[PDB]
Amino acid sequence: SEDFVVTDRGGIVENSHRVHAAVVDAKGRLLYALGNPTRMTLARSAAKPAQALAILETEGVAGYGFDDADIALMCASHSSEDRHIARTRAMLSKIKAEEADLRCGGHPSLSEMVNRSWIKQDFIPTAVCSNCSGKHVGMLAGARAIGAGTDGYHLPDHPMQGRVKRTVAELCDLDAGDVEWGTAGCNLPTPAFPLDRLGRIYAKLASAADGSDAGEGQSTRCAALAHIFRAMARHPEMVAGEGRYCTMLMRAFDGALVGKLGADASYAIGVRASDATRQLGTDGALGISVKIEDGNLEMLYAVVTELLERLGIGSPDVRSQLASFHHPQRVNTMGVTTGGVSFPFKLRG
Amino acid sequence: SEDFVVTDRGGIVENSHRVHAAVVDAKGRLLYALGNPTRMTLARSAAKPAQALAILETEGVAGYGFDDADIALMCASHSSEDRHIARTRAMLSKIKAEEADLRCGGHPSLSEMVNRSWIKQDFIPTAVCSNCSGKHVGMLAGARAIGAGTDGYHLPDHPMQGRVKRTVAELCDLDAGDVEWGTAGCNLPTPAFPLDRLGRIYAKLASAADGSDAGEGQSTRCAALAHIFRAMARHPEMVAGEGRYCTMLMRAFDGALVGKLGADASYAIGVRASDATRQLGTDGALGISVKIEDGNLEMLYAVVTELLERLGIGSPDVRSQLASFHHPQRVNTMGVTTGGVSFPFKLRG
Ligand SMILES: [Cl-]
Ligand SMILES: [Cl-]
Ligand SMILES: [Zn+2]
Ligand SMILES: [Zn+2]
């Protein structure tokens, strides 16, 4: 397949970007694809709901009283807005830990507007400012809850990371050896697996949400997955922030799906069963995963929004809240439009 | 044909980027290649030496007394450092123009350190700060020199832009219809032509420098090309700025070559004849042009530096000054090395 997103200047090709995507049902069966839907792919932050599941399944973590917004922050790549930093500090208090216990580092904010404020202030970001700070507090919580020590909670030999590694493989329905591990920007183990299994994780999230809402008896795992979905959809501003794709996406859809960014341009969406999912040929929930081969985020958001339109997910009115991402502005320094974005890719069934 | 630069996280593929490259002799004969060496490509700022030639060949421009550093700024994508703004203003004064005559617009600086200083002072960049401001003053100069009027100097129907279009096609050895035109970020016509012809332009620059140095009877155009080469090599800080690839590259090579960035990740180099170029099998100067298909600038500089090493251009000590670009750091927020860059491409003859 030769599936691309392409930018032009006056009709002349500027850049082209290879697209990979998987659309799967709740059991992970492949329904539609772009590119190579089984591309071995670092999920990066798109794995965070699976890491939050490992946190929430750690015995004793329930006693700390994390609320839904705290869980959404565990699932976040937040913009380090003051509310994200404050909630991180409030979560540290719940587990009687301190910022010095964190093993993630500060970085320039993922939001340009926040980062400009920091620059004006000469603000130096610290550990609680990390976009991953919520995940790290949850990992510290789990380490405290099982009692072997918080030192080294971020290292592969720690039981919290053994729990994460098993949980990821289980949600993917993969043997341990089919998940590879590197080290994240936030200094935790981070997984790679075929792209379609990232879709599978998010189909399982949305499916658990459907079962919870229907009143079905659920395993402890499915109940926790439903809780994670509900937390992300109820507090999408915790998952990213003002003006961010994931937040704007989840607000527009008002509970019908959850979406999550991975660094270097992966994206995952879990869609609750609907007229649209039935029209796509499945009787339950759906999962979507996307990777832009070269890592370009602006192209990722254009492609994800185009894919939602092609799949019929939402309505023109709902998806129109994402118009600035769908068709990125190509306006020069004098206000003249110089080109645009095109989608020469073809979904295959 | 399948030529990539690949980044990894712990040996796991993160992103990959398709590379196109042409290495040509002084007549444009293809000597080595990556990818598609004739890819139709927007040269963007890498066309600036051709545009400077059109300016310098305009009747009467010699009377303004532009010096080598002014010509270097005509060829620049500068960082908007105070010295670039000051030289822009001095060039405007040479032609008795003012900032309001410029038809380029301000933008965030190409240098992070300049841009952070601006953010701290709440500085809003204006036309005089454009990375293309030196080209624009040169175009105003040519318009005024032939009595065409400054108004509209940037529009395709203006005789200055007629001269630019002719000069570009002639340097490429192309018919007019083989060069396509869009509108630049700086609001001028900007050309697209086969990537190898960008290398041809720069081989002609270095060839002319060789012929000037050898005291050959040069055409006036060759003499002006030699002047442009000399100006860029003598004043590389004008062409980009502190810490910028083009500046560090040209300083390391100390007159042996010139190099120039194009936006969306094109690069061009003109190499004077040397033991290295003779070892590559040509008896004259050579040109190099590169495009990263997806537009990533970090990967461009890594690839260009790797190509100089494969081609044997420079000494190991000279190219070690570019080590930070050749293998970009992949260290996380806690100081842990998480990945690297690889060059599985192979130069073909
Ligand atoms: Cl990293
Ligand atoms: Cl533009
Ligand atoms: Zn992280
Ligand atoms: Zn320009």
XYZ file of C-alpha atoms and ligand atoms in Angstrom:
702
model
C 0.000 0.000 0.000
C 1.043 3.574 -0.769
C -1.010 5.527 1.772
C 0.196 9.103 2.255
C -0.746 12.494 3.611
C 0.788 15.212 1.434
C 1.301 18.959 1.767
C 1.521 21.217 -1.242
C 2.551 24.769 -2.107
C 0.470 26.055 -5.006
C -0.212 22.449 -6.008
C 3.495 21.557 -5.965
C 4.311 18.684 -3.573
C 6.181 19.907 -0.502
C 6.319 16.994 1.942
C 4.768 13.550 1.952
C 4.204 11.344 4.999
C 3.496 7.620 5.043
C 0.390 6.631 7.041
C -0.271 3.381 8.933
C -3.614 2.662 10.575
C -5.636 -0.207 12.010
C -9.379 -0.276 12.695
C -10.269 -3.302 14.842
C -13.240 -4.768 16.656
C -13.433 -5.523 20.382
C -11.659 -8.868 19.883
C -8.971 -7.194 17.770
C -10.142 -8.479 14.382
C -8.918 -6.134 11.649
C -11.775 -4.329 9.882
C -9.978 -1.597 7.911
C -6.371 -0.616 7.347
C -3.956 1.939 5.926
C -0.321 1.243 5.280
C 0.948 -1.633 7.399
C -1.612 -2.134 10.203
C 0.708 -4.527 12.043
C 3.743 -2.202 12.012
C 5.843 -2.796 15.124
C 5.235 0.539 16.873
C 6.299 2.282 20.056
C 2.978 3.250 21.636
C 4.666 5.852 23.865
C 2.015 7.849 25.775
C -0.792 6.034 23.962
C 0.010 3.100 26.300
C -0.899 5.197 29.343
C -4.420 3.768 29.817
C -2.823 0.304 30.016
C -0.313 1.605 32.548
C -3.177 3.181 34.514
C -4.906 -0.208 34.527
C -1.805 -1.749 36.074
C -1.861 1.022 38.706
C -5.562 0.591 39.456
C -5.202 -3.208 39.705
C -2.442 -2.841 42.290
C -3.917 -3.994 45.587
C -4.141 -1.129 48.060
C -4.172 1.736 45.563
C -7.950 2.110 46.073
C -7.273 3.233 49.678
C -5.518 6.417 48.524
C -8.768 7.888 47.230
C -7.748 8.942 43.742
C -10.759 10.433 42.009
C -11.720 10.353 38.316
C -9.758 13.504 37.528
C -6.693 11.972 39.166
C -7.111 8.845 37.002
C -7.486 11.003 33.883
C -4.174 12.632 34.883
C -2.573 9.164 35.138
C -3.751 8.689 31.536
C -2.450 12.114 30.440
C 0.182 13.801 28.326
C -0.826 17.080 29.886
C 0.215 20.623 28.905
C 1.636 21.374 32.386
C -1.058 23.965 32.995
C -1.192 25.167 36.584
C -4.171 22.893 37.235
C -2.165 19.854 36.055
C 0.813 20.720 38.259
C -1.423 21.419 41.240
C -3.281 18.147 40.809
C 0.046 16.319 40.632
C 1.053 17.829 43.976
C -2.361 17.003 45.436
C -1.942 13.353 44.286
C 1.510 13.199 45.892
C -0.121 14.244 49.170
C -2.664 11.432 48.915
C 0.190 8.899 48.980
C 2.400 10.815 51.462
C 5.144 11.200 48.866
C 7.111 14.243 47.796
C 8.296 15.684 44.502
C 11.808 14.375 45.233
C 10.440 10.797 44.981
C 9.526 11.257 41.316
C 11.892 9.863 38.705
C 10.553 11.854 35.741
C 12.113 15.168 34.726
C 10.697 18.509 33.651
C 10.638 19.533 30.002
C 9.359 22.472 27.928
C 5.569 22.417 27.956
C 3.746 20.523 25.213
C 1.597 23.673 24.901
C 3.229 26.574 23.121
C 1.153 29.083 25.103
C 2.116 27.589 28.453
C 5.750 27.408 27.407
C 5.728 31.078 26.378
C 4.465 31.994 29.848
C 7.269 29.919 31.366
C 9.860 31.652 29.197
C 8.567 35.112 30.195
C 8.770 34.068 33.873
C 12.144 32.239 33.640
C 10.287 29.249 35.034
C 12.364 26.065 35.349
C 10.103 22.974 35.081
C 10.630 20.269 37.670
C 9.415 16.690 38.023
C 5.800 17.532 38.856
C 5.610 19.491 35.601
C 6.276 16.408 33.452
C 3.448 15.610 31.038
C 3.729 12.100 32.555
C 3.609 13.275 36.171
C 0.235 11.632 36.860
C 1.415 8.230 35.629
C 4.506 8.556 37.812
C 2.510 9.418 40.936
C 0.288 6.396 40.213
C 3.383 4.181 39.858
C 4.712 5.500 43.173
C 1.301 4.799 44.690
C 1.385 1.193 43.529
C 4.937 0.750 44.776
C 3.940 2.076 48.223
C 0.814 -0.102 48.268
C 2.627 -3.375 47.798
C 5.453 -2.471 50.196
C 8.781 -3.322 48.544
C 9.981 0.290 48.381
C 9.531 3.389 46.235
C 13.192 3.564 45.309
C 13.523 2.307 41.768
C 9.776 2.186 41.062
C 10.547 3.286 37.491
C 13.049 0.453 36.737
C 12.189 -2.795 34.898
C 13.152 -4.994 37.848
C 10.655 -3.269 40.184
C 7.373 -5.196 40.740
C 5.387 -2.149 39.544
C 7.097 -2.419 36.176
C 6.683 -6.200 36.116
C 2.964 -5.533 36.632
C 2.965 -2.990 33.803
C 4.753 -5.370 31.430
C 2.355 -8.236 32.108
C -0.697 -5.971 31.854
C 0.328 -4.529 28.493
C 0.943 -7.978 27.018
C -2.408 -9.206 28.354
C -4.406 -6.291 26.921
C -2.636 -6.861 23.584
C -3.277 -10.636 23.772
C 0.416 -11.133 23.068
C 3.074 -13.342 24.585
C 5.647 -11.364 26.583
C 8.250 -11.917 23.869
C 6.121 -10.179 21.245
C 6.217 -6.885 23.184
C 9.528 -5.027 23.073
C 10.585 -2.399 25.617
C 12.624 0.794 25.508
C 12.959 3.743 27.888
C 10.523 6.665 27.678
C 11.277 10.383 27.706
C 9.644 10.307 31.147
C 12.218 7.639 32.237
C 9.910 4.563 32.481
C 9.893 1.355 30.428
C 7.821 1.968 27.330
C 6.368 -0.749 25.046
C 6.367 -1.538 21.330
C 3.904 -3.959 19.717
C 2.064 -4.322 16.377
C 0.015 -1.224 15.672
C -3.278 -3.122 15.451
C -2.873 -4.232 19.082
C -2.827 -0.591 20.147
C -6.237 -0.413 18.465
C -7.197 -3.566 20.376
C -6.398 -1.957 23.741
C -8.674 0.956 22.983
C -11.465 -1.267 21.626
C -11.321 -3.094 24.950
C -11.575 0.221 26.856
C -14.656 1.249 24.941
C -16.154 -2.233 25.148
C -15.764 -2.223 28.936
C -17.494 1.172 29.029
C -20.390 -0.312 27.053
C -20.680 -3.271 29.414
C -20.625 -1.046 32.482
C -23.337 1.257 31.110
C -25.461 -1.776 30.196
C -25.232 -3.151 33.736
C -23.425 -6.336 32.726
C -21.532 -8.369 35.286
C -17.863 -7.564 34.762
C -14.530 -8.936 35.847
C -12.438 -6.712 38.079
C -10.330 -5.903 34.977
C -13.287 -4.894 32.805
C -14.698 -2.747 35.606
C -11.326 -0.980 35.901
C -11.159 -0.476 32.114
C -14.640 1.032 32.222
C -13.498 3.350 35.015
C -10.470 4.476 32.979
C -12.659 5.214 29.939
C -15.131 7.157 32.067
C -12.332 9.144 33.733
C -10.771 10.187 30.412
C -14.108 11.123 28.863
C -15.272 13.031 31.957
C -12.002 14.931 32.438
C -10.506 15.337 28.947
C -8.815 18.571 30.035
C -6.690 16.460 32.406
C -5.642 14.134 29.560
C -4.136 17.024 27.585
C -5.301 20.618 28.114
C -6.820 23.695 26.556
C -6.519 23.766 22.786
C -5.038 20.247 22.672
C -6.303 17.687 20.177
C -7.176 14.942 22.681
C -9.134 17.348 24.845
C -10.983 18.967 21.952
C -11.687 15.552 20.417
C -13.097 14.040 23.592
C -15.163 17.124 24.432
C -16.697 17.193 20.953
C -17.709 13.533 21.216
C -19.169 13.924 24.738
C -18.530 10.362 25.933
C -18.836 8.489 22.635
C -15.093 7.795 22.480
C -11.726 8.386 24.114
C -8.556 9.336 22.287
C -4.913 9.566 23.261
C -1.702 10.898 21.714
C 1.590 9.024 21.611
C 4.791 10.964 21.074
C 6.351 10.748 17.588
C 2.872 10.688 16.068
C 0.877 7.681 17.164
C -2.775 8.012 18.055
C -5.374 5.695 19.505
C -9.158 5.947 19.818
C -11.700 3.700 21.520
C -15.237 4.054 20.148
C -18.342 2.919 22.040
C -20.829 0.841 20.047
C -22.992 3.060 17.833
C -24.831 3.308 14.529
C -21.483 4.221 13.024
C -19.652 1.172 14.399
C -22.469 -1.129 13.226
C -22.263 0.394 9.734
C -18.555 -0.489 9.785
C -19.468 -4.144 10.275
C -19.070 -4.915 13.975
C -21.633 -5.500 16.719
C -19.562 -4.071 19.579
C -17.016 -1.372 20.258
C -14.225 -0.324 17.919
C -10.553 0.631 18.187
C -8.503 2.878 15.898
C -4.728 3.250 15.902
C -2.555 5.439 13.659
C 1.174 5.996 13.142
C 2.782 8.624 10.885
C 6.014 6.897 9.814
C 8.208 10.011 10.097
C 6.701 11.240 13.387
C 5.000 14.485 12.309
C 2.286 15.499 14.803
C 0.571 18.121 12.627
C 0.064 15.442 9.990
C -1.098 12.936 12.614
C -3.990 15.113 13.750
C -5.035 15.872 10.166
C -5.038 12.155 9.338
C -6.887 11.079 12.489
C -9.580 13.656 11.818
C -9.831 12.609 8.172
C -10.099 8.987 9.244
C -12.949 9.782 11.621
C -14.769 11.453 8.731
C -14.148 8.490 6.402
C -15.381 6.026 9.038
C -18.527 8.087 9.640
C -17.744 8.523 13.331
C -19.616 11.474 14.798
C -21.326 14.081 12.647
C -20.067 16.956 10.523
C -21.067 19.250 13.398
C -19.178 17.241 16.016
C -16.108 16.778 13.844
C -16.129 20.465 12.791
C -14.752 21.432 16.230
C -11.554 19.814 14.911
C -11.458 21.713 11.572
C -8.220 23.529 12.446
C -6.503 20.141 12.848
C -8.217 18.469 9.906
C -7.008 21.017 7.323
C -3.942 22.706 8.829
C -3.515 26.392 8.004
C -0.941 27.139 5.260
C -0.729 30.964 5.463
C 2.524 32.845 4.985
C 3.986 35.797 6.936
C 1.830 38.272 4.939
C -1.515 36.485 5.352
C -1.481 34.814 1.923
C -2.579 31.167 1.681
C 0.222 29.189 0.025
C -1.023 25.615 -0.070
C -2.750 22.892 1.829
C -2.943 19.285 3.000
C -4.246 16.331 0.953
C -5.029 12.703 1.817
C -4.051 10.369 -1.049
C -4.662 7.248 0.976
C -7.382 4.637 0.532
C -8.981 2.673 3.345
C -8.968 -1.044 2.658
C -11.349 -3.558 4.151
C 15.539 3.906 -4.221
C 14.682 2.728 -0.689
C 17.040 5.057 1.187
C 16.217 5.975 4.800
C 17.501 7.615 7.919
C 15.989 5.791 10.888
C 15.684 6.731 14.538
C 15.378 4.163 17.280
C 14.498 3.906 20.949
C 16.546 1.107 22.452
C 17.005 -0.470 19.018
C 13.245 -0.349 18.312
C 12.335 1.666 15.213
C 10.789 5.019 16.143
C 10.588 7.069 12.945
C 11.999 6.592 9.489
C 12.580 9.252 6.869
C 12.991 8.832 3.107
C 16.132 10.504 1.700
C 16.683 11.898 -1.781
C 20.117 13.102 -2.812
C 22.028 14.108 -5.913
C 25.797 14.537 -6.225
C 26.642 16.204 -9.524
C 29.727 17.501 -11.310
C 30.210 21.067 -12.566
C 28.099 20.379 -15.678
C 25.340 18.692 -13.699
C 26.217 15.114 -14.630
C 24.914 12.789 -11.918
C 27.769 11.065 -10.056
C 26.059 9.603 -6.968
C 22.507 9.417 -5.723
C 20.137 8.484 -2.934
C 16.411 8.049 -3.415
C 15.111 9.850 -6.488
C 17.803 12.369 -7.518
C 15.450 14.098 -9.981
C 12.518 14.520 -7.550
C 10.608 17.685 -8.389
C 11.459 19.782 -5.330
C 10.651 23.212 -3.906
C 14.130 24.612 -3.327
C 12.817 27.292 -0.959
C 15.695 29.252 0.630
C 18.202 27.007 -1.075
C 17.403 28.989 -4.231
C 18.601 32.257 -2.622
C 22.054 32.314 -4.334
C 20.269 32.130 -7.702
C 18.005 34.995 -6.628
C 21.057 36.938 -5.434
C 22.570 36.450 -8.896
C 19.464 37.980 -10.503
C 19.795 40.943 -8.118
C 23.525 41.408 -8.731
C 23.082 41.223 -12.509
C 20.418 43.960 -12.468
C 21.534 47.166 -14.147
C 22.579 49.792 -11.613
C 22.686 47.601 -8.516
C 26.485 47.891 -8.505
C 26.127 51.603 -7.683
C 24.593 50.867 -4.284
C 27.896 49.510 -2.968
C 26.674 46.228 -1.463
C 29.615 44.428 0.097
C 30.392 40.742 0.699
C 28.467 40.569 3.948
C 25.435 42.244 2.324
C 25.517 39.624 -0.430
C 25.832 36.936 2.224
C 22.644 38.333 3.793
C 20.896 38.241 0.410
C 21.783 34.542 0.438
C 20.682 34.082 4.082
C 18.011 32.337 6.109
C 19.308 34.236 9.103
C 18.372 33.802 12.793
C 17.155 37.441 13.135
C 20.029 38.194 15.495
C 20.563 41.875 16.202
C 23.456 41.916 13.690
C 21.160 40.552 10.944
C 18.557 43.224 11.679
C 21.257 45.886 11.719
C 22.685 44.756 8.369
C 19.184 44.684 6.873
C 18.728 48.298 7.935
C 22.117 49.322 6.564
C 21.191 47.701 3.236
C 17.859 49.575 3.175
C 19.781 52.804 3.740
C 22.075 51.996 0.786
C 19.055 52.060 -1.561
C 17.291 54.892 0.313
C 14.375 52.627 1.235
C 12.561 52.068 4.495
C 11.232 49.099 6.436
C 7.694 49.913 5.284
C 8.814 49.119 1.704
C 9.479 45.482 2.598
C 6.804 42.996 1.537
C 7.995 40.110 3.735
C 6.535 39.603 7.191
C 7.947 38.877 10.625
C 8.022 35.367 12.070
C 9.332 33.533 15.155
C 13.109 33.405 14.903
C 14.726 30.368 13.321
C 16.942 30.344 16.465
C 15.392 29.106 19.713
C 17.713 31.343 21.764
C 16.785 34.470 19.802
C 13.111 33.531 19.990
C 13.266 33.078 23.768
C 14.879 36.507 24.153
C 12.032 37.980 22.077
C 9.377 36.207 24.175
C 10.910 37.643 27.352
C 10.751 41.208 26.000
C 7.274 40.713 24.464
C 8.857 41.575 21.129
C 6.679 41.220 18.019
C 8.896 40.592 14.956
C 8.329 42.845 11.946
C 9.309 42.769 8.280
C 12.912 43.795 8.960
C 13.361 40.668 11.122
C 12.402 38.187 8.360
C 15.003 35.489 7.742
C 14.574 36.544 4.061
C 15.007 40.273 4.708
C 18.331 40.447 2.846
C 16.812 38.894 -0.278
C 13.919 41.351 -0.066
C 16.215 44.369 0.224
C 18.119 43.040 -2.801
C 14.847 42.761 -4.761
C 13.859 46.285 -3.753
C 17.321 47.387 -4.871
C 16.926 45.825 -8.315
C 13.439 47.268 -8.725
C 14.637 50.772 -7.895
C 17.830 50.427 -9.954
C 15.915 50.010 -13.210
C 13.267 52.556 -12.273
C 10.491 49.968 -12.011
C 9.251 51.294 -8.685
C 9.349 49.519 -5.342
C 5.598 48.917 -5.182
C 4.879 45.337 -6.138
C 8.522 44.213 -6.467
C 7.466 40.846 -5.035
C 4.716 40.103 -7.537
C 5.242 37.746 -10.500
C 4.321 40.458 -13.030
C 7.091 42.760 -11.759
C 10.235 42.938 -13.955
C 12.422 42.034 -10.961
C 10.529 38.756 -10.655
C 10.809 38.285 -14.403
C 14.592 38.532 -14.009
C 14.548 36.069 -11.084
C 12.546 33.470 -13.029
C 14.882 33.708 -16.046
C 18.009 33.475 -13.907
C 16.834 30.408 -11.987
C 15.908 28.480 -15.120
C 19.201 29.437 -16.807
C 21.266 28.306 -13.821
C 19.322 25.005 -13.811
C 19.823 24.721 -17.606
C 16.049 24.288 -17.885
C 13.411 25.748 -20.144
C 11.000 28.142 -18.415
C 8.190 25.583 -18.486
C 10.331 23.050 -16.579
C 10.410 25.328 -13.486
C 7.217 25.520 -11.431
C 6.422 28.421 -9.111
C 4.535 28.846 -5.873
C 4.493 31.519 -3.172
C 7.055 31.498 -0.361
C 6.686 32.015 3.357
C 8.354 35.369 2.711
C 5.714 36.201 0.047
C 7.914 35.993 -3.077
C 7.612 33.581 -6.001
C 9.516 30.440 -5.083
C 10.728 27.784 -7.557
C 10.486 24.024 -7.891
C 12.710 21.986 -10.191
C 14.371 18.548 -10.196
C 16.542 18.024 -7.131
C 19.672 17.366 -9.176
C 19.373 20.845 -10.698
C 19.639 22.339 -7.212
C 22.967 20.498 -6.919
C 23.873 21.835 -10.371
C 23.386 25.450 -9.215
C 25.775 24.918 -6.308
C 28.362 23.051 -8.380
C 28.321 26.109 -10.650
C 28.916 28.323 -7.612
C 31.970 26.330 -6.497
C 33.206 25.931 -10.070
C 33.119 29.709 -10.544
C 35.050 30.182 -7.290
C 37.682 27.735 -8.574
C 37.890 29.589 -11.874
C 38.179 32.998 -10.234
C 40.961 31.697 -7.977
C 42.694 30.270 -11.076
C 42.582 33.645 -12.851
C 40.546 32.297 -15.761
C 38.764 34.613 -18.145
C 35.345 34.325 -16.536
C 32.062 35.440 -17.962
C 30.501 38.175 -15.878
C 27.948 35.654 -14.639
C 30.741 33.343 -13.529
C 32.476 36.261 -11.828
C 29.237 37.089 -9.986
C 28.751 33.435 -9.036
C 32.304 33.378 -7.679
C 31.478 36.541 -5.721
C 28.380 34.938 -4.205
C 30.388 31.860 -3.196
C 33.117 34.024 -1.663
C 30.556 36.141 0.182
C 28.808 33.143 1.745
C 32.088 31.474 2.762
C 33.542 34.700 4.155
C 30.425 35.671 6.135
C 28.717 32.380 7.087
C 27.288 33.950 10.239
C 25.217 36.195 7.954
C 23.902 33.192 6.038
C 22.422 31.682 9.218
C 23.797 32.620 12.625
C 25.269 31.409 15.890
C 24.909 27.666 16.381
C 23.186 27.200 13.015
C 24.136 24.298 10.775
C 25.051 26.349 7.699
C 27.294 28.660 9.724
C 29.036 25.871 11.609
C 29.428 23.866 8.390
C 30.972 26.710 6.428
C 33.206 27.770 9.316
C 34.511 24.230 9.726
C 35.401 24.015 6.005
C 37.039 27.492 5.876
C 36.296 28.280 2.242
C 36.300 24.739 0.867
C 32.532 24.718 0.301
C 29.325 26.633 0.810
C 26.091 25.238 2.184
C 22.515 26.459 2.407
C 19.271 25.296 4.025
C 15.892 25.225 2.313
C 12.748 25.150 4.460
C 10.984 21.750 4.710
C 14.355 20.058 4.731
C 16.257 20.617 1.521
C 19.981 21.278 1.569
C 22.549 22.246 -1.031
C 26.361 22.300 -0.987
C 28.887 23.555 -3.537
C 32.323 21.951 -3.083
C 35.481 23.431 -4.602
C 37.798 20.992 -6.382
C 39.920 19.073 -3.879
C 41.708 15.785 -3.306
C 38.279 14.550 -2.111
C 36.414 15.558 -5.265
C 39.153 14.118 -7.478
C 38.915 10.858 -5.505
C 35.179 10.845 -6.331
C 36.083 10.760 -10.020
C 35.524 14.304 -11.285
C 38.166 16.835 -12.323
C 36.208 19.926 -11.247
C 33.871 21.210 -8.542
C 30.860 19.261 -7.329
C 27.331 19.943 -6.135
C 25.259 18.116 -3.518
C 21.509 18.437 -3.021
C 19.363 16.595 -0.461
C 15.662 16.458 0.372
C 14.101 14.682 3.318
C 10.718 13.607 1.928
C 8.739 14.374 5.095
C 10.464 17.700 5.835
C 12.289 16.920 9.127
C 15.175 19.364 9.636
C 16.970 17.395 12.388
C 17.196 14.402 10.048
C 18.388 16.601 7.181
C 21.437 17.826 9.061
C 22.249 14.302 10.257
C 21.983 12.954 6.716
C 23.989 15.796 5.123
C 26.790 15.274 7.627
C 26.768 11.505 7.083
C 26.898 12.106 3.323
C 29.963 14.360 3.702
C 31.646 11.528 5.640
C 30.729 8.920 2.986
C 32.009 11.227 0.262
C 35.282 11.860 2.106
C 34.742 15.634 2.033
C 36.750 17.304 4.763
C 38.971 15.714 7.344
C 37.742 13.717 10.357
C 38.738 16.706 12.525
C 36.801 19.213 10.379
C 33.637 17.123 10.336
C 33.862 16.488 14.103
C 32.740 20.103 14.598
C 29.353 18.945 13.285
C 29.093 15.951 15.656
C 26.018 17.362 17.430
C 24.139 17.416 14.116
C 25.538 14.146 12.751
C 24.207 12.071 15.657
C 21.560 14.185 17.405
C 21.280 13.629 21.131
C 18.630 11.133 22.278
C 18.718 11.663 26.045
C 15.571 11.780 28.150
C 14.473 14.219 30.887
C 16.626 12.362 33.445
C 19.881 12.167 31.509
C 19.401 8.594 30.247
C 20.339 7.808 26.650
C 17.221 6.351 25.050
C 17.985 6.038 21.369
C 19.931 6.963 18.320
C 20.027 7.641 14.601
C 21.057 5.192 11.875
C 21.808 5.600 8.175
C 20.930 2.341 6.359
C 21.041 4.121 2.996
C 23.766 3.298 0.458
C 25.100 5.799 -2.050
C 24.749 4.520 -5.576
C 26.940 5.513 -8.490
Cl 13.824 10.399 25.195
Cl 3.920 29.622 3.870
Zn 5.877 8.789 30.054
Zn 12.003 33.850 1.213
